[PDB]
Design a protein around this ligand. Sequence first.
Ligand SMILES: [Cu+]
Length: 293
Amino acid sequence: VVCREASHAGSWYTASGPQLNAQLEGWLSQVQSTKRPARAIIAPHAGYTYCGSCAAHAYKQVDPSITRRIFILGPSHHVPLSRCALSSVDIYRTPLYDLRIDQKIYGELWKTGMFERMSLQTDEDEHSIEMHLPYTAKAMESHKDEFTIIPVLVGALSESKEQEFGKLFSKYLADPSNLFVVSSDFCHWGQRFRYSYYDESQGEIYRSIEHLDKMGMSIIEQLDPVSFSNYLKKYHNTICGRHPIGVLLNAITELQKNGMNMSFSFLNYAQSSQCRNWQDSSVSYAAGALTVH
Ligand SMILES: [Cu+]
């Protein structure tokens, strides 16, 4: 058709509009805005019942009176993708209100030939982008009729491809009217994820997970894509949105080469549970914001 349905409403977040509106409002109430206006954010894409309050720390930094085009870069979980993919529909539906895809930017991005066209089934099967639509619509409701979205599915990008896509999106990141939402959870720890790296010097397992995550968070705060690449090559932390992050980090360094000065700061860290023994498992969530100066 012409609309991507809220395919994960009911399961990953409440399908009731009034209830969803109230939940996001409540999570956003407990956050004080400190990084307005955010040029980019990093936010988790798990179920709202796990990461809702954490993701609110990122969306409170969005200034709806400034932002007009919202890029959402999410990792692919079901489709083999070596590049980036664009949607084939024109509207993304949410229980709050439906979001419009910026046709001008979609034509510019498609005309590069670096992007693939993802089918409607692939679109609705994926959740890494959709989990940010209700939060985006809520934070932008004061200007609900003046903003568009640019969905981008990010595949298994090579380091060179992360740099190429980063330089491409850098021209859009430099626009003050643009916002880049980078979707990622952090450490998936446990036997279910086949990842059990544990540094006993850090104490308990959940403290080792915390130290491992915040090492990667600090590198992001240093805006260093090469150090982030090495950190992933050294510890193999199960950060599922590492490719969108690497794309953003390269976009920042391309802007730094052109005189622009920026600062990224993480604002909330959380874990779905606190692992203490080898039979435990947890997923970490981190919310951060990028500000341009
Ligand atoms: Cu994930």
